[PDB]
């Protein structure tokens, strides 16, 4: 009745896609033995969204994990839920990854991504009802970003008039010790502004900052931080994971989150501060659940509530409690600060409540909400792209197979035309009192 299936693109993407599908499958339990594991049959269509039926009452994904360096796919795939798939996938070739954007986007087309369009033509045809497919796009290197934007550009022509789930991963320059980060990421998001529907720009930089400076973690490996981003994306995906009183399709939510469909950049957080690493088992009840909802600590960006003009916020409360006190505290947070007062779509909140717990902590929540302090993130990446562009810096192998100055010039010009329009929309208070008619009508 509804499907969104799995595909991967990114050096830091395969691991997080596998772990994210584990943590959305960790409380559902579809085994690779060949028999059904029914414990709660009210998530039939809910698990059919991601795990589609291909055998006798066995629900399998269409997971195509594609890597040009398939060692990670060779290593991490043999999991509990990592073998219950249709086996005609993981199409792979060893032509190389090389951390290069240009040769990944340019020469590796007919080698692997033509088989990738063929296999997603076949695997989106022999099923019930398609609504797109899922991918954890990562900007850790160049080849992953190039193949992700190749897939986006080819699926805007494969099924053009269809909302398809597009993600991104903001890299961690503290951890990613590559000598050139901001070329592929900035030109990729340049393409993705006018090539997509939505971007949940989850990160590894600010989450590294908060686990090293606030959570006091002595071991900031990719494992527990991947668990952190997996819990955050689980709280994101709770809209389609659980059958609520509305059972909201993400096709509606993609149109819901856009005020104008050019600008689709906001990232979630996790309001009650989950305890991966430094651990606690306390039940996060309502006032401590909501007290950390407006924080300048946990949100995975350059935190600035002062530099905040949020457009649409939504927090799924799958903790079993009524929403009257939640809405009262929502009104208190809404009116206690003047930065949130923008007054477009004056009912720009959402309270969706289910009863299916994510983990052994039965009553808890998360934070998703429109992000406006991303202007300093875009500047912090773009001006250090232009830092290593002025002297034609690092053309060692970014001199691609087809190279122009017009592509980079137009890339930075549209980057300027999105940051300037964003700062024009963060200013020019054209709904609160900024018109000419609040002070009478005639003031010359």
């Amino acid at each position: 009745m509804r499907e969104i299936v799995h595909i991967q693109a990114g050096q830091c993407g395969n691991q997080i896609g596998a772990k994210f599908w584990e943590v959305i499958s960790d409380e559902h339990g579809i085994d690779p033995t060949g028999s059904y594991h029914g414990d709660s049959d009210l998530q039939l269509e809910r698990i059919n969204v991601y795990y589609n039926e291909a055998a006798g009452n066995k629900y399998v994904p269409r997971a195509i994990l594609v890597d040009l360096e398939p060692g990670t796919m060779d290593s991490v795939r043999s999991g509990p839920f990592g073998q219950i798939f249709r086996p005609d996938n993981f199409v792979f070739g060893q032509s190389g990854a090389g951390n290069n954007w240009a040769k990944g986007h340019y020469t590796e087309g007919a080698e692997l991504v033509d088989s990738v369009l063929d296999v997603v033509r076949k695997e989106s045809e022999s099923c019930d009802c398609l609504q797109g497919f899922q991918l954890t796009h990562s900007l850790g290197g160049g080849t992953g970003s190039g193949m992700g934007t190749l897939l986006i550009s080819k699926i805007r022509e494969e099924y053009p008039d269809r909302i398809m789930n597009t993600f991104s991963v903001v890299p961690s320059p503290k951890v990613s010790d590559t000598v050139v980060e901001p070329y592929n990421a900035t030109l990729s998001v340049h393409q993705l502004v006018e090539n997509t529907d939505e971007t949940y720009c989850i990160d590894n930089e600010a989450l590294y900052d908060i686990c090293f400076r606030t959570l006091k973690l002595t071991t900031p490996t990719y494992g527990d931080l991947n668990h952190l981003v997996s819990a955050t994306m689980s709280g994101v995906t709770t809209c389609l994971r659980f059958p609520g009183q509305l059972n909201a399709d993400l096709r509606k939510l993609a149109v819901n989150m856009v005020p104008f469909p050019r600008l689709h950049f906001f990232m979630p957080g996790f309001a009650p501060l989950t305890s991966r690493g430094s651990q606690q088992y306390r039940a996060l009840t309502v006032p401590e659940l909501t007290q950390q909802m407006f924080d300048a600590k946990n949100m995975m960006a350059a935190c600035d509530p002062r530099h905040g003009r949020y457009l649409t916020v939504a927090a799924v409360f799958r903790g079993r409690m009524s929403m009257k006190e939640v809405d009262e505290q929502m009104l208190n947070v809404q009116n206690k600060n003047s930065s949130y007062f923008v007054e477009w779509i004056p009912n720009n909140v959402k309270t969706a409540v289910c009863d299916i717990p994510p983990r052994g902590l039965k009553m808890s929540a998360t934070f998703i909400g429109n992000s406006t302090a991303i202007q300093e993130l875009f500047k912090r990446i773009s001006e250090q792209f232009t830092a290593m562009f002025r002297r034609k810096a690092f053309l060692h192998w970014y001199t691609g197979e087809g190279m122009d100055e017009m592509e980079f010039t137009e890339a930075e010009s549209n980057m300027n035309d999105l940051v300037s329009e964003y700062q024009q929309y963060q200013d020019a208070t054209a709904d609160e009192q900024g018109e000419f008619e609040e002070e009478g009508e005639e003031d010359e």
Partner: protein, 55 residues
């Protein structure tokens, strides 16, 4: 005689910027305040050029 003086006061009218929809809600209040201050001074100058030239 003062047909250029009324063009000077129309230039004081022409020193008016727009009320700036691209203007922070604290800042175009300042534009309005310097407006009313400058036409207070303009009204003083206007009754100057009215009373003095009549003699």
């Amino acid at each position: 005689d003062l047909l250029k003086a009324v063009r000077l006061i129309k230039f004081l009218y022409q020193s008016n910027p727009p009320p700036n929809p691209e203007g922070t809600r604290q800042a175009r209040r300042n534009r309005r305040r310097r407006w009313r201050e400058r036409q207070r001074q303009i009204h003083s100058i206007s009754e100057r050029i009215l009373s003095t030239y009549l003699g």
